[PDB]
């Protein structure tokens, strides 16, 4: 109250000096009961790769995951790379293929090859890539018959989309068939490289999902009901308590929402039960004072809470389950307006000295002492 | 195997309050949702036929079929109809039915009698035979068709109805589940059907959805039809 | 000719460790791309559902087998386990490896109906003892 | 959730009309949406015998099928064979859990 009032003398009156929170006593996380590991001896090392222009999927499914073997063999989007390691998801797309050191920055969701013409890199990417030089130890001169080049088409195509068809397109005043003119080329070359493909691994993480059957490294813990926990439900964090919803789900649903944007009920991803998200109890902090004039003797008045929610034993609270860095008080009584600790109620009525909510007032009277 | 049938005009009928979907996997309940979605127009012309023509598909078709018992067996999806694109083809055969995405080449007039719907069905990449969608002129079967990037989605639902037999598609609202969600990558333009007949078209509409205790949608409300729904 | 082979020991004590292997005989028809589930049924009572599994993850549990054990598909060797580890003195009781229904190419699709339509032999555990 | 009320045994006089049932609640069979008779001879395996509410699968012949309408799902059995003397069972696929239930079983008896 004197920090809040900048004052080293306080007036006779309640005032609102913090908020009451509670802290996350269990931090749980929790994930699929899954033992498998990525095999990732297949992912970062090949021989054979396909085209530049029609490449193809290896998809990495049901795999989990570790990034602290990345650099056994970089440009990363999305997310950023020192957290893709606790994102949960359901399937990872591979979406490898090979490129030139002219071609090392036009394959991306920003900046101009051939794959803007044959088979495309979305603009709405939300993988992880590898950028792999490999012209020190695969030298040679023609990377493959199957890589080649081109520099433009009639028109372009949507991301995955495949249309490898080798004829001249037109760009001009006429149509042509088999006809060179203004426009009408075929620019189709093979790669012809000097001192050696040059190769990337992509993988693409997807969204919109079903239950998550990959997950990050983490190693999963037990479930904690009706206490305030700091949980993680396949990436969704958050503070609050997890109750049993009684809300009727249908298997597909994973998430349920209420009317802000945010996520009002979660599906265990281990027993498959319906977990309310409530966040543990809070409410602002009075201050009930009779002046530091009179007395130092203070009460506390912990608003719209029960005195349940509340830390009463005040020997206990130094291993802080609550935000409140201290706990003060004697007496607790249960009000309307909150609960009151440190103000003895009584049953005589008196006149409204210092007043607290529905009816309930505050005094600093003689009962002999003072109280 | 291509035989000749006869062409006849088309009819037009009213939609009254039906084609309303779910629009989304979160489930909802006792709230009124404001959405921007693709959904038949409230009170539109929907084309009533009785043969089998070639329509487009125009980002997404209601379909619905009026009939006594099982006379059109299934559907036909693609940009052309020839071997030179994937397709894809949907068949109720009787117990079953049978889905795919392939290459194909079709007929002039696909139908079921046999079978004579296409003639090759080369380099098939997707097949999927299970319980047949078809359920239950008393019977009617409604469908919605909404091809997204990446996702084909049918949306169904099956009633028995007594209402006078023509241009009586009835009033009244029912929230079409969701059937099936195919993960083909193929463009479509167009579609056929194998052999009453009603298909209204899907435009970008802005619904007001009334979800109630149990998640189910029992009304539905566009601003845009009327100044009183805004 | 479509055959489902069972195979697992039959007399455990409780918390001990057990395992039921499916294979498939040989057949085309239910060995590579079809949704699988297990079946337990008391001795004197009926038929009741605990496992199924849709193409490679997709597992949906019975209450009682909720987080009781896992269930796992090797689709290589058609190799379908479901481990029996420290069983509750409820699970005496005859199993029955089945298919489901439906052939699916290439994709993770999503359908909203299950089946059960070739069915095992059935293999006898006792657990109460 | 299952809510499948099945009689336990019926009359199985040889060449006669059988009808049996199960009725559950309206999220599984109240769909008109995936319901499954089983035929369960005593020590072999229970075959599925009918499906898609009426639907016949390979090999199970006629005037013997399924009237589900709404709620309650009902088999007729018309000319009982010796081989049919055997006991039937539910399972309808529920949104709400999934939980695959399954009736008690109509235990039929020839006499």
């Known amino acids: 109250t004197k920090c809040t009032l900048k004052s080293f003398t306080v007036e006779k009156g309640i005032y609102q000096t913090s908020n009451f929170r509670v802290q996350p006593t269990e931090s749980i996380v929790r994930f699929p009961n899954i033992t498998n590991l990525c095999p990732f001896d297949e992912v970062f090392n090949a021989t054979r790769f396909a085209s530049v222009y029609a490449w193809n999927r290896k998809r990495i499914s049901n795999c989990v995951a570790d990034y602290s073997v990345l650099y056994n063999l970089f440009k990363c989007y999305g997310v950023s790379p020192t957290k893709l390691n606790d994102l949960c998801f359901t399937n990872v797309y591979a979406d490898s293929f090979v490129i030139r050191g002219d071609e090392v920055r036009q394959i991306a969701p920003g900046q101009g090859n051939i794959a803007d013409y044959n088979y495309k890199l979305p603009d709405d990417f939300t993988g992880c890539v590898i950028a792999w030089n490999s012209n020190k130890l695969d030298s040679k001169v023609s990377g493959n018959y199957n890589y080649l080049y081109r520099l433009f088409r009639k028109s372009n195509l949507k991301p995955f989309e495949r249309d490898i068809s080798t004829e001249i397109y037109q760009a001009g005043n006429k149509p042509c068939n088999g006809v060179a003119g203004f426009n009408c080329y075929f620019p189709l070359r093979s790669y012809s490289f000097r001192p050696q493909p040059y190769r990337v691994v992509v993988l693409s993480f997807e969204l919109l999902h079903a239950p998550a059957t990959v997950c990050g490294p983490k190693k999963s813990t037990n479930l904690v009901k009706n206490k305030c926990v700091n949980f993680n439900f396949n990436g969704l964090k958050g503070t609050g308590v997890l109750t049993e919803s009684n809300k009727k789900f249908l298997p597909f649903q994973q998430f349920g929402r209420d009317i802000a944007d945010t996520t009002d009920a979660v599906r265990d991803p281990q027993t498959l039960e319906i977990l309310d998200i409530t966040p543990c109890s809070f409410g602002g902090v009075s201050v009930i004072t009779p002046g530091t004039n009179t007395s130092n003797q203070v009460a506390v008045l912990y608003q719209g809470v029960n005195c349940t929610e509340v830390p009463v034993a005040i020997h206990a609270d130094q291993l802080t389950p609550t935000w409140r860095v201290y706990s003060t008080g004697s007496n607790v009584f249960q009000t309307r307006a909150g609960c009151l600790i440190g103000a003895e109620y009584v049953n005589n009525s008196y006149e409204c000295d210092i007043p607290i909510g529905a009816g309930i007032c505050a005094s600093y009277q003689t009962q002999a002492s003072q109280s | 195997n291509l035989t000749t049938r006869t062409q006849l005009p088309p009819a037009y009928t009213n939609s009254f309050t039906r084609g309303v979907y779910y629009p989304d996997k979160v489930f909802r309940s006792s709230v009124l949702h404001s959405t921007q979605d693709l959904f038949l127009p409230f009170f539109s012309n929907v084309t009533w036929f009785h043969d089998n023509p070639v329509l487009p598909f125009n980002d997404g078709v209601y379909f619905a079929s009026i009939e006594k018992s099982n006379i059109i067996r299934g559907w036909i999806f693609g940009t052309t109809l020839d071997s030179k694109t994937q397709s894809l083809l949907i068949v109720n055969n009787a117990t079953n039915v049978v889905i795919k995405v392939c290459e194909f080449q079709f007929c002039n007039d696909p139908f079921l009698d046999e079978f004579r719907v296409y003639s090759s069905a080369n380099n098939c990449t997707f097949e999927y035979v299970s319980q047949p969608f078809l359920m239950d002129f008393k019977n009617l079967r409604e469908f919605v068709f909404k091809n997204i990037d990446g996702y084909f989605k049918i949306y169904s639902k099956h009633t028995p109805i007594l209402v006078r037999e023509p241009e009586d598609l009835p009033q009244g609202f029912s929230a079409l589940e969701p059937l099936v969600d195919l993960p083909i990558g193929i463009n479509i333009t167009r579609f056929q059907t194998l052999l009453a007949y009603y298909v209204g078209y899907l435009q970008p509409r802005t619904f007001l959805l009334k979800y109630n205790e149990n998640g189910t949608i029992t009304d539905a409300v566009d601003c845009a039809l009327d100044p009183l729904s805004e | 000719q479509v055959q489902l082979q069972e195979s697992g020991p039959g007399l455990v004590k409780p918390s001990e460790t057990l395992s039921l292997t499916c294979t498939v005989s040989?057949?085309?028809?239910?060995?590579?791309?079809?949704?699988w589930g297990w079946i337990r049924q008391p001795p004197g009572k009926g038929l009741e559902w605990i496992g199924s599994?849709?193409?490679?993850?997709?597992?949906y549990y019975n209450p009682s087998l909720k987080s009781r054990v896992t269930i796992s598909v090797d689709t290589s060797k058609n190799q379908f386990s479901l481990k029996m580890n420290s069983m509750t003195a409820a699970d005496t009781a005859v199993y029955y490896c089945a298919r489901l229904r439906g052939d699916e190419i290439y994709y993770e699709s999503s359908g909203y109906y299950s089946y059960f339509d070739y069915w095992g032999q059935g293999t006898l555990v006792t657990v109460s003892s | 959730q299952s809510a499948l009320t099945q009689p336990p045994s019926v009359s199985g006089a040889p060449g006669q009309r059988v009808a049996i049932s199960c009725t559950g609640s309206?999220?599984?069979?109240?769909?008109?949406?995936?319901v499954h008779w089983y035929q369960q001879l005593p020590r072999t395996a229970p075959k599925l015998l009918i499906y898609?509410?009426?639907n016949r699968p390979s090999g199970v012949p006629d005037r013997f099928s399924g009237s589900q309408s709404g709620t309650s799902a009902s088999l007729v059995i018309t000319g009982l064979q010796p081989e049919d003397e055997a006991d039937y069972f539910c399972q309808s696929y529920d949104s709400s859990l999934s939980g695959y239930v399954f009736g008690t079983g109509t235990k039929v008896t020839v006499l």
């Open positions: 898609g509410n009426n």
């Open positions: 599994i849709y193409y490679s993850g997709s597992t």
């Open positions: 309206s999220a599984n069979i109240g769909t008109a949406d995936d």
């Open positions: 040989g057949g085309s028809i239910s060995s590579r791309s079809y949704y």
